[PDB]
Every structure is written in structure tokens, then in C-alpha cells.
Design an enzyme around this catalytic site. Structure first.
Site, PDB file in Angstrom:
ATOM      1  N   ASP A   1      -0.534  -7.350   1.832  1.00  0.00           N
ATOM      2  CA  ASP A   1       0.072  -6.015   1.910  1.00  0.00           C
ATOM      3  C   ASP A   1       1.597  -6.060   2.125  1.00  0.00           C
ATOM      4  O   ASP A   1       2.101  -5.699   3.197  1.00  0.00           O
ATOM      5  CB  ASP A   1      -0.602  -5.200   3.018  1.00  0.00           C
ATOM      6  CG  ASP A   1      -0.294  -3.728   2.902  1.00  0.00           C
ATOM      7  OD1 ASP A   1       0.189  -3.311   1.829  1.00  0.00           O
ATOM      8  OD2 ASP A   1      -0.555  -3.011   3.858  1.00  0.00           O
TER       9      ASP A   1
ATOM     10  N   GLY B   1       2.191   6.403   8.551  1.00  0.00           N
ATOM     11  CA  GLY B   1       3.608   6.930   8.453  1.00  0.00           C
ATOM     12  C   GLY B   1       4.567   5.844   8.900  1.00  0.00           C
ATOM     13  O   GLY B   1       5.753   5.856   8.534  1.00  0.00           O
TER      14      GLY B   1
ATOM     15  N   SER C   1       3.629   2.691   8.358  1.00  0.00           N
ATOM     16  CA  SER C   1       3.324   1.655   7.378  1.00  0.00           C
ATOM     17  C   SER C   1       4.512   1.204   6.569  1.00  0.00           C
ATOM     18  O   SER C   1       5.273   2.085   6.124  1.00  0.00           O
ATOM     19  CB  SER C   1       2.246   2.137   6.366  1.00  0.00           C
ATOM     20  OG  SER C   1       1.135   2.624   7.071  1.00  0.00           O
ATOM     21  N   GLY C   2       4.629  -0.073   6.321  1.00  0.00           N
ATOM     22  CA  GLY C   2       5.736  -0.675   5.602  1.00  0.00           C
ATOM     23  C   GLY C   2       6.866  -1.071   6.519  1.00  0.00           C
ATOM     24  O   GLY C   2       7.682  -1.887   6.099  1.00  0.00           O
TER      25      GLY C   2
ATOM     26  N   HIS D   1       0.841  -1.206   0.000  1.00  0.00           N
ATOM     27  CA  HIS D   1       0.000   0.000   0.000  1.00  0.00           C
ATOM     28  C   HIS D   1       0.878   1.259   0.000  1.00  0.00           C
ATOM     29  O   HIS D   1       0.328   2.372  -0.131  1.00  0.00           O
ATOM     30  CB  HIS D   1      -1.049   0.062   1.125  1.00  0.00           C
ATOM     31  CG  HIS D   1      -0.664   0.530   2.468  1.00  0.00           C
ATOM     32  ND1 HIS D   1      -0.250  -0.254   3.508  1.00  0.00           N
ATOM     33  CD2 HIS D   1      -0.642   1.793   2.939  1.00  0.00           C
ATOM     34  CE1 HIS D   1       0.011   0.493   4.568  1.00  0.00           C
ATOM     35  NE2 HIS D   1      -0.214   1.743   4.232  1.00  0.00           N
TER      36      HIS D   1
END
Ligand SMILES: [Ca+2]
Length: 222
Positions: free
Chosen positions: A84, A174, A176-177, A40
């Protein structure tokens, strides 16, 4: 990161910032040439910043490397944020040192109760917590029943919940990942949640241990 603590500078050596004019997502270095992030967070081109602590201040430890390729999981589906996970190929290999070290991919899946660390430069929802310096948080993996209870019917085999049902401590936008490290291996990828650090809305993470075949298959396809 909400309710966490500022990480000891460089205690999370695999942590990377994904930048496109500004920090927008995290990632984990899994080897000299590859980074794992959230599908994402996808952009055809990004700059991977390694060796960071304070993203707004040059420290002398950083390495900025552009991506040669950004590969989202072939089965990623946004309406439910399933699968994801994304792989980023560096245009040039990272230099491993005191500040930059890869994190190993999980052999097996960690069970409920396992204590893990999540880190990031995302929102802290605190005046006192500076999102510019890497924030750390320990979170336990929740049971599948507590996870599915929180988000009825929204949890797939590629997700796991981690954090606190009471709220107060969580990953946020922020982050995320970014990595979820348990016993020295990458167990999760910061993926989604309803709000941040809210009661009954734990964080949801991509479950790296079921993607090992796809990950290694792809890293061998340079
Ligand atoms: Ca810096």
C-alpha cells in the site's frame, strides 16, 4: 487522528494534503519533486497541497501543485491491502522554506518499541479536536507477534502495527497516505485498521524500509 494533539503549526513540514475537490488522503514530500502516499489513495490526477496547517483557511504558507503522474506499487493488492504505497510526481518542484521540507527515506527498519509521530487531517472522533487543523500523535511500533495476533494471518512483510492495543489513540480514515516518522525518517505510511482507536485493533502501516529499491528506482525514472 484520534486521541492526539493539534500539531505545532508547521512542525511536520513534509506533510501534504491530497485534494480532489476536498482533502481525501495525506502524503509526505520526500524531495522537491516527489510525494509518497498510499496506493489505496490512488487517483490518476490530484492536487498536492503543501505548507498547510488549517486546510480550510488560507494562511499564506501553502503551495498547490497538480500531479504530473501517480504511480501505485506494481504489486498493490486491494483485497488484503498489501504493498500500500504510491509515488506522486509534482508538475512543478516544491519550494522548500520554513513551511515546506522533505522527509528522508529510511536507511533501515525501525524495531519494536520505537516511538514515532503520525499526523493528519482525518477523523478525530472528538467534538473538541478539529480535523481541519493538523493533528499529531506519538505511537510506538508494536512487535510482529502483537501485530499478527491482532489480525491473524493478515500481516505481510510490507506492514507493521503501531499504536495502542488498549485503544483510545490511533490514525483514522482521512489520515491514510500520511507519514509515520521515527527519528527523522519516514518509516510508515498510514494504511488500514479495523475501526479507529478500538481495543485490540491497532493501526497497520506500509513498511517503507523494504521499498527503498523500488522508490529510488522510480524517482530516477522521471
Ligand atoms: Ca491553509
Amino acid at each position: 487522528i484520534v486521541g492526539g494533539y493539534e500539531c505545532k503549526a508547521y512542525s511536520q513540514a513534509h506533510q501534504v494534503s491530497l485534494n480532489s475537490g476536498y482533502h481525501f488522503c495525506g502524503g509526505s514530500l520526500v524531495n522537491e519533486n516527489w510525494v509518497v502516499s498510499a496506493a489505496h489513495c490512488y487517483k490518476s490526477r490530484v492536487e498536492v497541497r503543501l505548507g498547510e496547517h488549517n486546510i480550510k483557511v488560507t494562511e499564506g504558507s501553502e503551495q498547490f501543485i497538480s500531479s504530473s503522474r501517480v504511480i501505485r506499487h506494481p504489486n498493490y493488492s486491494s483485497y488484503n491491502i498489501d504493498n500500500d504505497i504510491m509515488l506522486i510526481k509534482l508538475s512543478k518542484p516544491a519550494t522548500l522554506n520554513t513551511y515546506v521540507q522533505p522527509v528522508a527515506l529510511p536507511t533501515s527498519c525501525a524495531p519494536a518499541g520505537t516511538m514515532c509521530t503520525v499526523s493528519g487531517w482525518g477523523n478525530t472522533m472528538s467534538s473538541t479536536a478539529d480535523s481541519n487543523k493538523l493533528q499529531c500523535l506519538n505511537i510506538p511500533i508494536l512487535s510482529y507477534s502483537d501485530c499478527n495476533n491482532s489480525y491473524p494471518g493478515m500481516i505481510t512483510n510490507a506492514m507493521f502495527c503501531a499504536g495502542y492495543l488498549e485503544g483510545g489513540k490511533d490514525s483514522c480514515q482521512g489520515d491514510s497516505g500520511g507519514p509515520v516518522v521515527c527519528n527523522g525518517e519516514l518509516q510508515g505510511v498510514v494504511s488500514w485498521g479495523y475501526g479507529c482507536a478500538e481495543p485490540g485493533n491497532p493501526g497497520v502501516y506500509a513498511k517503507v524500509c523494504i521499498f527503498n529499491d523500488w522508490l529510488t528506482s522510480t524517482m530516477a525514472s522521471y
